Structure 1
Amino acid sequence: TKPMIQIALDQTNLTDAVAVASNVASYVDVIEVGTILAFAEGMKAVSTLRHNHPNHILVCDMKTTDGGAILSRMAFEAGADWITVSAAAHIATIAACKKVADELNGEIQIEIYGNWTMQDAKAWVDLGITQAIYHRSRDAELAGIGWTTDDLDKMRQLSALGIELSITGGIVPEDIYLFEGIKTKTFIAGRALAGAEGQQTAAALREQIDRFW
């Protein structure tokens, strides 16, 4: 609906992450266990956060590429509401993750990486998947060229298929206007939503979200 504010926790230990979750909980809608924290600490991270923050949407960012039935179940059982699955997973793996999600009252989000196509995106939607994470393209980022027409058009196409995007990649309040008319579930950021000025920046993000949704 109105895009939510999501923090990606990418700490390399649970103690630190637990202290950040505990800090930002009051002004963040979605807390994500990032893949760096997932691989540092394992599903204990997801558990501990789920118990600390029973009322937040909790994401486990595994970027699952294979072994989906098993991984999905582990993450949901540990307490995740949403899990991420790589666009590069075979469609049978994606379907296996979505089957577990539908059984456990969770959702799948496709992390868009690799040589992905619009046909792939339609396959996701055909499984009933309605979420995908769109990252500002790595080429653009490296060239310092910002958000390109190409990206915004791809996002609009994804949107026209029924995918609700989570938008990420240096997102700042001045960029928000760029995505008006794109179906957007969340804007994601890491620690620029954390610490002492995280609050201010979040109010600032929301202020701009309200204008365009």
Structure 2
Amino acid sequence: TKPMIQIALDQTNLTDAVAVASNVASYVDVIEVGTILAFAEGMKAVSTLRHNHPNHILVCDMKTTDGGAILSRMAFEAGADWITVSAAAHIATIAACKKVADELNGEIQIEIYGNWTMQDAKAWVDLGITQAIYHRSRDAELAGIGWTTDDLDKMRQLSALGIELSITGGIVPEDIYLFEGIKTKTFIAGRALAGAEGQQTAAALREQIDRFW
């Protein structure tokens, strides 16, 4: 179906995260406990937001790199629907996270970082993982060159493997067209979805989403 709107909560305290989530809930589909909030407060953040927003999809972004069986279980038990696992995790860790996700009826999302390869992506799909978080290339962000042909190509390759991407990195309404035809689960933003104009930004994103999906 069409791409959903996801807010990444990266506040350094739970009181502020709870305030934001409360303010944005009526117009976001997915609420994410970002890695910053997760380290600031621990699994209490997940449980709290789970209780506050029971009808939202809830993500715990741990970028799990090792101890996957234990971390996956903790996050799922706390109430996460989806959790993130670093692409740099050993494939056995990734499998362990997946085993826990299947036990607990959650899902794994691969956070794409490091010297990752399409061989690696194929191994994720072979474990039955069908979600990845694709960040605008950092080199491109630093250089100011936007979303490059190479990033879009890589996203197309992943989509062709059956991976449903969450796309993130300076996402704004006027760039949505770029992702036409990419298998996209969500668009993820942070501050753009909060505050005075977050509601109108969400609506501007949805308008663009509806043109292309």
TM > 0.5 between the two?
Answer: yes
Structure 1 unmatched runs, 5+: none
Q: Normalized against structure 1, the TM-score is what?
A: 0.99
Q: Distance in 2 between matches of 1:151 and 1:191?
A: 23
Deviations 1:155-211 (A, max 9, x none): 000000000000000000000000000000000000110012100000000000000
SS of corresponding position for 1:76? helix
Deviations 1:136-167 (A, max 9, x none): 00000011111100000000000000000000
Q: Normalized against structure 2, the TM-score is what?
A: 0.99
The number of residues matched between the two structures is 213
Deviations 1:24-79 (A, max 9, x none): 11000000000000000000000000000000000000000000000000000000
Q: Which residue of 1 aligns with 2:200?
A: 200
**How far has the Cα of 1:105 moved from its partner?**
1.1
Query: 4+ residue runs of structure 1 moved beyond 4 angstroms?
Result: none
Q: Distance in 1 between matches of 2:126 and 2:24?
A: 36
SS of corresponding position for 1:176? helix
SS of corresponding position for 1:108? strand
Alignment of 1:46 onto 2:49: no
Deviations 1:73-100 (A, max 9, x none): 0000000000000000000000000010
Structure 2 unmatched runs, 5+: none
Alignment of 1:21 onto 2:21: yes
Q: Distance in 1 between matches of 2:75 and 2:195?
A: 27
Q: Distance in 1 between matches of 2:74 and 2:68?
A: 10
Q: Distance in 2 between matches of 1:168 and 1:30?
A: 13
Q: Distance in 2 between matches of 1:145 and 1:20?
A: 31
What CA RMSD, in Å, does the superposition of the two structures yield over aligned residues?
0.4
SS of corresponding position for 1:38? helix
Deviations 1:85-133 (A, max 9, x none): 0000000000000010011110000000000000000000000000000
Q: Distance in 1 between matches of 2:101 and 2:147?
A: 32
Q: Which residue of 2 aligns with 1:110?
A: 110
**How far has the Cα of 1:10 moved from its partner?**
0.2
Q: Distance in 2 between matches of 1:75 and 1:131?
A: 17
Q: Distance in 2 between matches of 1:95 and 1:21?
A: 32
SS of corresponding position for 2:109? strand
Q: Distance in 1 between matches of 2:24 and 2:98?
A: 30
Q: Which residue of 2 aligns with 1:164?
A: 164
Q: Distance in 2 between matches of 1:122 and 1:26?
A: 37
User: Counterparts in 2 of 1:63-142, with a 5 A limit?
Assistant: 63-142=63-142
SS of corresponding position for 2:2? coil
